C-alpha cells in the first residue's frame, strides 16, 4: 500500500543520508589506498 | 629480532597489497555515495 | 603465487634497506672524488 | 730513490684520475640510494 511504500522510501532516504555521511571517511580511505598503490608499483609489486 | 622484522614487514606488504587491490571497489563506493548525497541534498 | 611475490618483495625491501645503510659511506666517497676531480683539473689533467 | 718517487706519484696520479672519472657513476649511486632510503623509511 501507499503507507508501506512511503515507509520504505523514508528508509531509502535514511540510507542515502548515511551514505552521504560516510563520504569524507570514504574519500580519506581512497587517498590512503592510492598512496599504497603508488608504493606497491614503485617497489615492483 | 630477524624473524620479528620479517613478520612485521610481511604484514605491511600484505596490508599495502590489500589497500591497492581494494582501490577500484572503494572508488565505486565513493561514486555511489556522491550520487546518494546529491539526491539526498536535493530532496531532503 | 602471492607467497613467492611477497618473499621477493621482502627481499627487495632488504635491498633498499642495505642501499640506505650504504649512503653515508657513499657520500664520503663522492666528496673524496670531488676533491680528486678539483685537483685533477687544477694540475691540467 | 728517483724511480720509487715516480712509481709512487704515477700511481697517485692514476688513483686521482680514477676517482675523478668515477664521480658521475658514484653520484648516480648516491641518488639511487637516496631514493631507496626515502621509500624504505616511508614503508618500513
From Swiss-Prot, chains A, C:
Tissue spec: Widely expressed, including in skin and keratinocytes, with highest levels in adrenal gland, rectum and thymus.
Cell compartment(s), UniProt = Cytoplasm, Cytosol
- Residue ranges of coiled coil: none
Q: Which domain of life is it from?
A: Eukaryota
User: How does it associate, per the subunit comment?
Assistant: Associated with AP-1 and AP-2 complexes.
Q: Which disease is it linked to?
A: Keratoderma, palmoplantar, punctate 1A: An autosomal dominant dermatological disorder characterized by multiple hyperkeratotic, centrally indented, papules that develop in early adolescence, or later, and are irregularly distributed on the palms and soles (other palmoplantar keratoses have mostly diffuse hyperkeratinization). In mechanically irritated areas, confluent plaques can be found. Interfamilial and intrafamilial severity shows broad variation. In some cases, PPKP1 is associated with the development of early- and late-onset malignancies, including squamous cell carcinoma.
Query: What is the role of the protein in this entry?
Result: May be involved in endocytic recycling of growth factor receptors such as EGFR.
Q: What is this protein called?
A: Alpha- and gamma-adaptin-binding protein p34
Which organism does this record belong to?
A: Homo sapiens (Human)
Question: Which gene produces this protein?
Answer: AAGAB
Amino acid at each position: 500500500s501507499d503507507v508501506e511504500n512511503f515507509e520504505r522510501l523514508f528508509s531509502k532516504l535514511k540510507e542515502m543520508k548515511d551514505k552521504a555521511a560516510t563520504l569524507p571517511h570514504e574519500q580519506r580511505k581512497v587517498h590512503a589506498e592510492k598512496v599504497a598503490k603508488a608504493f606497491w608499483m614503485a617497489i615492483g609489486g
